[PDB]
Amino acid sequence: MKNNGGARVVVIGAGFVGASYVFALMNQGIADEIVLIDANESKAIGDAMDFNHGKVFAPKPVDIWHGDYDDCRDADLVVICAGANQKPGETRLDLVDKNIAIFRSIVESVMASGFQGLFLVATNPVDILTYATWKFSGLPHERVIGSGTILDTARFRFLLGEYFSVAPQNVHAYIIGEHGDTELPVWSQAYIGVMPIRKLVESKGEEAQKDLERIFVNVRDAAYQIIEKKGATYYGIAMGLARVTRAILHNENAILTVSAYLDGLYGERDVYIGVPAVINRNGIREVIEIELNDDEKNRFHHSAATLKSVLARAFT
Amino acid sequence: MKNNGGARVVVIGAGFVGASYVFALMNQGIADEIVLIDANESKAIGDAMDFNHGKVFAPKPVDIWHGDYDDCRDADLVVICAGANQKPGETRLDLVDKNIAIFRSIVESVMASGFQGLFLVATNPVDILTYATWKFSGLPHERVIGSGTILDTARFRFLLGEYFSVAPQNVHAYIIGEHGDTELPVWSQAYIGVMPIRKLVESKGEEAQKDLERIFVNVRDAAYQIIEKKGATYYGIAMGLARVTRAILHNENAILTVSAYLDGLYGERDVYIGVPAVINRNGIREVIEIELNDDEKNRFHHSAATLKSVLARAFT
Amino acid sequence: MKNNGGARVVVIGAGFVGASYVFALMNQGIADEIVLIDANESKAIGDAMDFNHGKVFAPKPVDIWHGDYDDCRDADLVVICAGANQKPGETRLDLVDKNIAIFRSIVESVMASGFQGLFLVATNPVDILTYATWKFSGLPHERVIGSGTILDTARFRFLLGEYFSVAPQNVHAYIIGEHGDTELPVWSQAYIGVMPIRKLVESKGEEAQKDLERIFVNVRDAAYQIIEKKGATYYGIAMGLARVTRAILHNENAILTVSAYLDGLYGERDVYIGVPAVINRNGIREVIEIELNDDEKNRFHHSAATLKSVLARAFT
Amino acid sequence: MKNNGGARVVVIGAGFVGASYVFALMNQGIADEIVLIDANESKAIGDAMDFNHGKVFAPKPVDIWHGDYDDCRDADLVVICAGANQKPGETRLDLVDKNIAIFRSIVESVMASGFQGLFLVATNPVDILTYATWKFSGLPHERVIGSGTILDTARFRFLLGEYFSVAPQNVHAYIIGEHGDTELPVWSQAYIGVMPIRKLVESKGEEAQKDLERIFVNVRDAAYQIIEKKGATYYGIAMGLARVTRAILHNENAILTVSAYLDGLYGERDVYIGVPAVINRNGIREVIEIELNDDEKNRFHHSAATLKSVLARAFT
Ligand SMILES: NC(=O)c1ccc[n+]([C@@H]2O[C@H](COP(=O)([O-])OP(=O)(O)OC[C@H]3O[C@@H](n4cnc5c(N)ncnc54)[C@H](O)[C@@H]3O)[C@@H](O)[C@H]2O)c1
Ligand SMILES: NC(=O)c1ccc[n+]([C@@H]2O[C@H](COP(=O)([O-])OP(=O)(O)OC[C@H]3O[C@@H](n4cnc5c(N)ncnc54)[C@H](O)[C@@H]3O)[C@@H](O)[C@H]2O)c1
Ligand SMILES: NC(=O)c1ccc[n+]([C@@H]2O[C@H](COP(=O)([O-])OP(=O)(O)OC[C@H]3O[C@@H](n4cnc5c(N)ncnc54)[C@H](O)[C@@H]3O)[C@@H](O)[C@H]2O)c1
Ligand SMILES: NC(=O)c1ccc[n+]([C@@H]2O[C@H](COP(=O)([O-])OP(=O)(O)OC[C@H]3O[C@@H](n4cnc5c(N)ncnc54)[C@H](O)[C@@H]3O)[C@@H](O)[C@H]2O)c1
Ligand SMILES: O=P(O)(O)OC[C@H]1O[C@](O)(COP(=O)(O)O)[C@@H](O)[C@@H]1O
Ligand SMILES: O=P(O)(O)OC[C@H]1O[C@](O)(COP(=O)(O)O)[C@@H](O)[C@@H]1O
């Protein structure tokens, strides 16, 4: 129901990421009901109108309306996009003090609501803030999901889809670790088809080679390059979130590189970090523990350590 | 062709209306090729990147990129969403001399591209600018479509879908004439299902009555209300642009309330104005001359009386 | 859930009508789980299989299987496309005896399954069996829905769209009453947009009149010409089915002309017949009482009369 | 254009597969114009109307009709589905002389249209009949595509997707060689994510081992479990055909395992067979030569060895 008995998705923090997220769902026709909750009520309000006015044309009927935390109680997924945005220069981590703060309230209000579905966090630092969402709430880590490396993984696929002129969609590779600076390309297990990548290049020596490194860097700095170009990013994320949201509402068991919490799986513990996980109706079915090279073993590990410390000194 | 062979939609003015628009094409999966052209290349470039990052998740494989007017030589439709934005407070039509000027260039360049597809105009005041576009392009008018009243109707429908509690989609009423303050709601020909509106409300005077004029006023007011709440309308128009587009791209013979040129049809000539028209792969097949009551017969000629002014005066 | 948590549709009779309707849900990505119960094992098996091998190409993850009646406890929809079909020569009603027999067990076998969702019937004669299905089910009549004249209406707009060269989707006309030879065209409430049909032809020559008239005959007789060419009809109906399926599963508030039960609504009572009705997540919200003309009230009434007699003469 | 201006696909042989295909495309929203040509018009006249009756509820406007060869002159794509179906006990190869004979005409007749698009061959033996169309068409072999191992592959991924409990859309494996008995699963290069199959099963040796070979057999034999349960297969092959069709029509640069010409690539020349290949607006871009263990190579050669004997004797 669009009228309380359907797929109700609640968006907390309706700015660029937020609202784009909503426009993608509407266009895509993914949820039944969509609630917008934002501090800037007005924003929540015009936006809502704005969506409803174009609805005569969406592919599927959906119920959009501006709400409150009580709308939570009944929603299936609480997607969080409120908070501070990295300005030019700043990293992801320069926000932790800022956001964790906001999360204490947000998360408290939705729990108080009587809520009980899953949580989809998108705010940066996505690995820091999903752990906190997991904490501040007390639900199983299995129902607190962060975008993680879904935006980064898709950029990879895009760039490599372009290098070899094949559908991104037929490009098989991941970026894991912190959705940020310590992220890493899992070259060791990257494929174009079923044909490994680090083997179609072995024929074009120290070109393929430099070329490949080049992509990764573009990958890794995407945000900064786009932040610099138009101030904030959000279409890349909107699609990423819209994609995760259907694995769930459609109980898909789609492998997705998202922010999963580990406790020994990658030889790391008590950290939320981007890793392959099977997503379904009930949140994370399980984290996939892919075979890494010593090289990867090492930077993944370097990344896990990085987050680790932030958490260390960053709780509440 | 994703590579110089299919539906090439070229967007000029990658600001809000523009990009939101491109966003919809992308999720609905409507064009094969999408090119962006904005005076502000930076903008246009972080948008093309931001777009592309999400497409491994897009419904349909699309080709988005930042181009230039030569990318027009090959396009089926060029949508204009560039130009100056009416600001808060109260200013629509005050965007004329302003916009006329900008049109003067864009057209030239595009026409210079060696373009021969359709123009889709969205800048304000949409009707004025449609004329200009047509004038400056010198393509037959049946190939210069304006968005005119396509948003104002989505809204009547939505508002009445709601009063009446039916899919907006089952609400059949129109808004024509100026896409601005002289617009009029065609009550004489407004249905719910196949049942006259003023007959459904028949039974409940100066109640349902007053509720009918209250809906319409919020129709007319819509932009000024959103603009004050979130500063600029853009999701509703994008869903709007998106619709027409499929009319064209799919040889649909859809009936939309667009900006069409008159030559005697509503007792008016030399005026691009909002009026139901059969759209299809070759532009407007014809203007549909509904019948109006004396009253609506009056507002219409009135609205038209108004636009003709502006043109009389801000052409030359 | 493809996994016991989604929208589940049980299909009883995987014949032409049955299986084609399943093929629709799947290419449209409409339900999460699709159960097929056919009195013919192999077949039901043959198809679940054949369905399955293609879904990798399906637009939406969908779980399809060959089930049984326990399957019905958790389904949201039970669609019945089982039993005997008219032969060249036969009419809808010659099937009554043959088929009421089959709904007793089926209707029983599901009610005992612990079933508590909505029924959508399509076996012919579609209005006798919608009545039989509500009775034998002892559910509120608003939860037992028959396809009725959805297909009839569909061929009208198709045809009317073609004559006037407008999108099927732009012709607004109904085919009410019986889903057989007594059905009638509400020519009094038909529009091409907001333009009364009998007023576009009001201008014409070589009987737009005659032509209009000829359409309906074509509508009326369509099964018969189609049966005579390819042996049975199933694609039209597969599309009406999936349409309703949508109104329901999406809590849509869609006005459809389905086989609904009247309790004094068209001056008729205790009968299942084609009439416009708002459809949503809880069965039928209400029957719409369009205003008929004297000729139409007349044929409506004679249609209802033909039905009651069979109800009256062939109850189980 | 729904009106001589878009992507026109022609279906020669509106049988089970021919017709299902059209059902796949219409629901999915892929062509603009679909022409049906059958030895037996009636069949064709029957489907056409059946189809048209339901189009008011198709997602996108499409135009169906029963035409003829001239409708091929303007055709983007000519999909051949006409000819004799393998009977139970009968092999793919007992059909050859039957089906060659028919292709000489059909082929010759479309050419003569002034046909100049691409050919997608479905009729069995697919590798043999695709070669035949190329032979008979005199067009460059990049324009004569057979469906070869696309279903065989739709099948392997669905079965493993189940064995492992991941979305089939997430199993990366192929079936190559003759669409028939000599086909082979490319085990040496199959993943479930980014992780090697014979690595996941590594841990439960000779259980995972046996499981995996059953699957394979189920795949190999699937044609016949179905021929025997329900008499003809047509739902998988139709989703498979729909998929190619979009690869082309969207100039997607997709990698599918199709029947393609070998001119050295797997150390085989002058044979048409199931091999991965990039597909776009111009048909086949290239054959993809993946890496094979000795075993795969051997069978693959062996398979080739077989097509090659049939052809030697099969010319017309
Ligand atoms: N993880 C990803 O891949 C990713 C990608 C892009 C952007 N982002 C994240 O998105 C976040 C902000 O995104 P943005 O650019 O859309 O910013 P934005 O300003 O557009 O949106 C933030 C919104 O949150 C609302 N908000 C603030 N405090 C609130 C509170 N206490 N309760 C409810 N709502 C509140 C504000 O009203 C504002 O509208 C950043 O943290 C950024 O890191 C994440
Ligand atoms: N037609 C409708 O119903 C409707 C609805 C809403 C808004 N609008 C109209 O949309 C128009 C623009 O919309 P917006 O709010 O997104 O404004 P915006 O400022 O955000 O975007 C307009 C863009 O045009 C660009 N531009 C200006 N001159 C250009 C040129 N010569 N070449 C290329 N790019 C150029 C600017 O850089 C800017 O990016 C306004 O004129 C507004 O009135 C129309
Ligand atoms: N309502 C409409 O517009 C409409 C349109 C077209 C056709 N039809 C109706 O659909 C009905 C059948 O259509 P069809 O062409 O698919 O017939 P069909 O023979 O091809 O299919 C009927 C199926 O029912 C199965 N069946 C028989 N007894 C059963 C039982 N007890 N439980 C489960 N399955 C059982 C058969 O084995 C077969 O699979 C006919 O009444 C026909 O009049 C209705
Ligand atoms: N490649 C695949 O994976 C695949 C899968 C399944 C079935 N099939 C192939 O499909 C073929 C037939 O399929 P079906 O089950 O739908 O058969 P069918 O008998 O239902 O359809 C075949 C059609 O061919 C028509 N036809 C015959 N000669 C013709 C001619 N000269 N010109 C035009 N039309 C002509 C017939 O009248 C009939 O309409 C078989 O040969 C089989 O090998 C292929
Ligand atoms: O590359 P293949 O094996 O042909 O498979 C393509 C399928 O894989 C996907 O790209 C998913 O890939 P990932 O496993 O990398 O998530 C789908 O989008 C697509 O349908
Ligand atoms: O003629 P209009 O007002 O543009 O109406 C089109 C709308 O009507 C519909 O065709 C439904 O029509 P009905 O009201 O006749 O059921 C929708 O599918 C479509 O969005």
Instruction: State how far the Cα of B279 lies from the Cα of B255, in Å rounded to an integer.
Output: 6
Tokens coding B110: 């595009």
Breaks (C-N over 2.5 A) in chain A follow: none
Instruction: State how far the Cα of B27 lies from the Cα of B304, in Å rounded to an integer.
Output: 37
Q: Contact B146/B250 with Cβ under 8 angstroms? A: no
In this structure, the answer to whether residues A143 and A167 fall within a common structural domain is no
Q: Are strands A144-146 and B184-185 parallel, antiparallel or unpaired?
A: unpaired
In this structure, the answer to whether residues C15 and C26 fall within a common structural domain is yes
CATH number for position C96: 3.40.50.720
Please return the burial class of A5, using the count of CB atoms within 10 Å of its CB with bins 0-12, 13-18 and 19+.
middle
Written as one string, the DSSP assignment of A236-291 is: HHHHHHHHHHHHHHTT--EEEEEEEEEESTTS-EEEEEEEEEEEETTEEEEE----
Residue having the nearest C-alpha atom to atom 44 of ligand 1: A123
Sign of CA dihedral A294, A295, A300, A302: positive
Instruction: State how far the Cα of D298 lies from the Cα of A185, in Å rounded to an integer.
Output: 35
Indicate the SS3 state at residue D269: strand
Residue having the nearest C-alpha atom to atom 18 of ligand 5: A169
Cβ-based contacts of C233 with chain D (< 8 Å): 50, 53
- Active-site residue, from B53, B66, B179, B302: B179
In this structure, the answer to whether residues C114 and C177 fall within a common structural domain is no
Written as one string, the DSSP assignment of D162-174 is: HHHTS-GGGEE--
The angle formed by the CA atoms of residues D203, D198 and D179, to the nearest 5 degrees, is 145
Instruction: State how far the Cα of A79 lies from the Cα of C39, in Å rounded to an integer.
Output: 46
Of B84, B113, B148, which residue is a domain's last? B148
Q: How many CB atoms lie within 10 A of CB C275?
A: 26
Pocket around ligand 3 at a 6 A CB cut-off: C 12-18, 37-40, 43, 81-83, 85-86, 95, 102, 105-106, 122-124, 126, 147, 151, 179, 232-234, 237
- 3-class DSSP string for chain B: CCCCCCCEEEEECCCHHHHHHHHHHHHHCCCCEEEEECCCHHHHHHHHHHHHHHCCCCCCCCEEEECCHHHCCCCCEEEECCCCCCCCCCCCHHHHHHHHHHHHHHHHHHHHHCCCCEEEECCCCHHHHHHHHHHHHCCCHHHEEECCCHHHHHHHHHHHHHHHCCCHHHEECCEEECCCCCCEECHHHCEECCEECCCCCHHHCCCHHHHHHHHHHHHHHHHHHHHHHHCCCCHHHHHHHHHHHHHHHCCCCEEEEEEEEEECCCCCEEEEEEEEEEEEECEEEEECCCCCCHHHHHHHHHHHHHHHHHHHHCCC
Cis ω before C61 (30° cut-off from 0): no
Residue having the nearest C-alpha atom to atom 32 of ligand 1: A39
Please name which ligand lies nearest the alpha carbon of C80. 3
Find all residues with CB under 8 Å of D74, minimum gap 6, and list them: D4, D8
A301 included as an active-site residue: no
Please return the burial class of C314, using the count of CB atoms within 10 Å of its CB with bins 0-12, 13-18 and 19+.
middle
Give the distance from residue D275's alpha carbon to the nearest chain A alpha carbon, in angstroms.
12
Instruction: State how far the Cα of D228 lies from the Cα of D232, in Å rounded to an integer.
Output: 8
Instruction: State how far the Cα of C184 lies from the Cα of C304, in Å rounded to an integer.
Output: 12
| Beta-carbon separation of C250 and A280 below 8 A | no
The alpha carbon of residue A137 and the mean position of all alpha carbons in its chain are separated, in whole angstroms, by 19
CATH number for position A178: 3.90.110.10
Distance (angstroms) between ligand 5 centre and the Cα of D93 equals 33
Instruction: State how far the Cα of D148 lies from the Cα of A227, in Å rounded to an integer.
Output: 47
Please return the burial class of C243, using the count of CB atoms within 10 Å of its CB with bins 0-12, 13-18 and 19+.
buried
Give the orientation angle of helix C150-164 with respect to helix C235-249, to 10 degrees: 110
Instruction: State how far the Cα of A79 lies from the Cα of D229, in Å rounded to an integer.
Output: 47
3-state DSSP percent of chain D in helix, strand and coil, to 5 = 50, 20, 30
| Beta-carbon separation of B254 and C172 below 8 A | no
Return the bridge partners of D175, or none.
D185
In this structure, the answer to whether residues D206 and D92 fall within a common structural domain is no
Instruction: State how far the Cα of B2 lies from the Cα of D282, in Å rounded to an integer.
Output: 11
Find all residues with CB under 8 Å of A233, minimum gap 6, and list them: A151, A222, A223, A226, A227, B46, B50, B53
Mutate which of C28, C163, C176, C255 to disrupt the B interface (most B C-beta within 10 Å)?
Answer: C255
Q: Contact C144/C137 with Cβ under 8 angstroms? A: yes
In this structure, the answer to whether residues B126 and B84 fall within a common structural domain is yes
| Beta-carbon separation of D251 and B280 below 8 A | no
Give the orientation angle of helix B126-137 with respect to helix B96-113, to 10 degrees: 40
In this structure, the answer to whether residues D91 and D236 fall within a common structural domain is no
- 3-class DSSP string for B163-196: HHCCCHHHEECCEEECCCCCCEECHHHCEECCEE
Indicate the SS3 state at residue C276: strand
Give the distance from residue C315's alpha carbon to the nearest chain D alpha carbon, in angstroms.
32
What are C's interface residues with A at a Cβ cutoff of 8 A? 1-3, 5-6, 32, 60-61, 250-253, 280-281
Q: Contact A162/A261 with Cβ under 8 angstroms? A: no
Of B10, B16, B17, B119, the residue with max ligand 2 atoms within 8 A of its CB, to mutate for a pocket test, comes to: B17
Strands (DSSP E) contained in D83-127 are 118-121
Q: How many CB atoms lie within 10 A of CB D178?
A: 31
Of C148, C180, C207, which residue is a domain's last? C148
Cβ-based contacts of A179 with chain B (< 8 Å): none
Q: Contact D63/D3 with Cβ under 8 angstroms? A: yes
* Unique residue bearing structure tokens 């007699």: C309
B126 lines ligand 2 (CB under 6 A): yes
Cβ-based contacts of C117 with chain A (< 8 Å): none
| Beta-carbon separation of D229 and C46 below 8 A | yes
In this structure, the answer to whether residues C141 and C177 fall within a common structural domain is no
Q: Contact A275/A286 with Cβ under 8 angstroms? A: no
Provide the experimental method for this PDB entry: X-ray
Q: How many CB atoms lie within 10 A of CB C316?
A: 10
Which residue in C has a C-alpha nearest to residue B161's C-alpha?
Answer: C253
Of D148, D168, D183, which residue is a domain's last? D148
The closest CB to that of B276, out of C59, C186, C193, belongs to C193
Find all residues with CB under 8 Å of C75, minimum gap 6, and list them: C8, C9, C10, C33, C35, C115, C117
* Unique residue bearing structure tokens 């509720």: B211
Query: In chain D, how many domains are there?
Result: 2
| Beta-carbon separation of C55 and D158 below 8 A | yes
Instruction: State how far the Cα of D187 lies from the Cα of D196, in Å rounded to an integer.
Output: 9
The closest CB to that of C250, out of A60, A250, A280, belongs to A60
Instruction: State how far the Cα of D276 lies from the Cα of D289, in Å rounded to an integer.
Output: 8
Distance (angstroms) between ligand 4 centre and the Cα of D18 equals 7
Q: Contact C28/C55 with Cβ under 8 angstroms? A: no
Query: Rounded to the nearest 5°, which phi and psi values hold at A281?
Result: -65, -30
Tokens coding A139: 């639900």
C31: left (phi over 0), alpha (psi -120 to 50) or beta: beta
The closest CB to that of C2, out of A2, A61, A251, belongs to A251
Tokens coding A10: 């609640």
* Unique residue bearing structure tokens 């609905």: B28
Binding annotation of A for beta-D-fructose 1,6-bisphosphate = 157, 169-172
In this structure, the answer to whether residues D127 and D255 fall within a common structural domain is no
Say how many CB pairs under 8 Å bridge A and B: 147
Please name which ligand lies nearest the alpha carbon of D57. 6
Query: Rounded to the nearest 5°, which phi and psi values hold at A138?
Result: 80, 15
The closest-lying atom of ligand 1 relative to the alpha carbon of residue A43 is: 39
Please return the burial class of B173, using the count of CB atoms within 10 Å of its CB with bins 0-12, 13-18 and 19+.
buried
Q: Contact D22/D44 with Cβ under 8 angstroms? A: no
Q: Contact C149/C175 with Cβ under 8 angstroms? A: yes
Tokens coding A73: 């109680």
Instruction: State how far the Cα of C16 lies from the Cα of D37, in Å rounded to an integer.
Output: 22
> Which 8-state DSSP code applies to residue C205?
S
Instruction: State how far the Cα of D125 lies from the Cα of D135, in Å rounded to an integer.
Output: 15
Q: Are strands C195-196 and C191-192 parallel, antiparallel or unpaired?
A: antiparallel
- Active-site residue, from C66, C141, C179, C250: C179
In this structure, the answer to whether residues D134 and D250 fall within a common structural domain is no
H or E element in which residue C78 lies: strand C77-80
In this structure, the answer to whether residues B165 and B277 fall within a common structural domain is yes
Resolution in Å, one decimal place:
2.5
A126 lines ligand 1 (CB under 6 A): yes
Indicate the SS3 state at residue C14: coil
Q: How many CB atoms lie within 10 A of CB D209?
A: 12
H or E element in which residue D278 lies: strand D269-280
Q: Contact B209/B220 with Cβ under 8 angstroms? A: no
| Beta-carbon separation of D235 and C54 below 8 A | yes
Q: How many CB atoms lie within 10 A of CB C99?
A: 20
In this structure, the answer to whether residues C133 and C178 fall within a common structural domain is no
| Beta-carbon separation of C195 and B254 below 8 A | no
Q: Are strands B144-146 and C269-280 parallel, antiparallel or unpaired?
A: unpaired
Tokens coding B212: 């009918």
Return the bridge partners of B195, or none.
B192
Query: Rounded to the nearest 5°, which phi and psi values hold at B174?
Result: -130, 165
Task: Determine the structural domain holding residue A17 and report its residue range.
Answer: 1-148
The closest CB to that of A250, out of C32, C251, C253, belongs to C32
Give the distance from residue A7's alpha carbon to the nearest chain C alpha carbon, in angstroms.
10
H or E element in which residue A104 lies: helix A96-113
B85 lines ligand 2 (CB under 6 A): yes
Indicate the SS3 state at residue C121: strand
Q: Contact B252/B279 with Cβ under 8 angstroms? A: yes
Cβ-based contacts of A50 with chain B (< 8 Å): 226, 230, 233-236
The closest-lying atom of ligand 1 relative to the alpha carbon of residue A124 is: 43
Q: How many CB atoms lie within 10 A of CB A63?
A: 18
Indicate the SS3 state at residue C145: strand
In this structure, the answer to whether residues A108 and A185 fall within a common structural domain is no
Closest by alpha carbon to C123, among C95, C143, C153, C87? C95
